[model samples]
Target chain A: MKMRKFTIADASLERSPGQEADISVGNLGPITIGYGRYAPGQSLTETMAVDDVMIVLEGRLSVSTDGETVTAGPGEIVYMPKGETVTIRSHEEGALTAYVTYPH
Target chain B: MKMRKFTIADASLERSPGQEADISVGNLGPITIGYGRYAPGQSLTETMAVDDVMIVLEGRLSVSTDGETVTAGPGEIVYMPKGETVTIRSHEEGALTAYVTYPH
Candidate 1:
């Protein structure tokens, strides 16, 4: 077993620009934690096959899965089950920090 | 399912004086999340029957289980299996804040 600390700044080092936005991935156990930051009006589109736990750390976001939409603010936790087509978009001009973990 | 935010200040309301120290218990799903704060030179003694994921949110702690001792600082995460004799103690004059989650 290993123990470590991670911060938003450290996330930049492992980040990569996705087709729609940028994402930093951290893998632990059967979970894949992605530390992602999005700009205002930016959108993230993906169809994930694993259970996802989204922890919003900063800013606001409008996330849509299937045909349903929900707004999330800082400190709000959201869970999205597998096999969902999700799209995330920011409504305001600010940085959105989120930790997304996928269960294997 | 429900989502909510929590802080150390909120932990005080759920806390109780344990045999060795104090502990706050929060239950979610099959997991029992314990928000614990230990004073200097204080100890917490308990034997749990579920998998525990301990996140040290503040201060320092020395934890021993199954004859293995480990020291954890702020932002460190530790995992302990079930059926272990675990004890935790603090060495400095400060508060040790930790979140322990048990698996079902």
Candidate 2:
């Protein structure tokens, strides 16, 4: 039971290729929650280390893996599996997402 | 990982007293992600059984426990400690929150 409060801007994010992600909760626990904001035309290509479910909060995003591509809009959710080569592409104005991951 | 897309209305919420909550992700896993929508003037006073972190997505919300109280709005995150007596109160338009909990 850790008690804390923060805004999207207050949670420090670890910069990626063209985005920042703040793993704000469950850093030492099983489930981790992260907030990610991607810049326009910015993209990230990496292998996911854990299973995560993300809901797009703003703009649009395109995620691709294993030659499969999926697009997400506001209020839409995308699930990324662990150990997969994932590429996240952002649209104009970028994209914002709130995600929950496990095996943390 | 589960691959499914559903809006707040499609996720099938388990109705509460004054709100509807849909645990969309990680149903059979450790981390559970839920989307909650509260109706105006709706309230829920109950003892928390798990640890959760929530981010207010719409409207405003008032959370109180014991003698302390906190107000959260859109884009704000709140960490509710487990084993606490919690009271969640919504404003006129009610509130929407995205939360992740453990021990699921």
Best by TM-score: 2
Chain B global fold similarity (TM-score) for predicted model 2 against the true chain B: 0.78
Number of the top DockQ candidate? 2
Q: Candidate 1, residues A1-104: lDDT per residue as tens digits?
A: 33333444545633555323335444544544455566677777777666555545567777786567887765344555566677778767644443434344
Residue range A13-60, candidate 2, lDDT tens digits: 544443555455435245566678887888888888887778788888
Task: Give each model a TM-score.
Answer: 0.54, 0.79
Give the per-residue Cα lDDT of candidate 2 at B67.
79
lDDT of 1 by residue, B2-102 (tens): 33233344456334554233354444444344456666677776775665555455577777876578877654445555666678787675444444443
Most lDDT-accurate candidate: 2
Model 2 chain B poorest 10 in a row by lDDT: B20-29
The CA lDDT at A102 in model 1 is 38
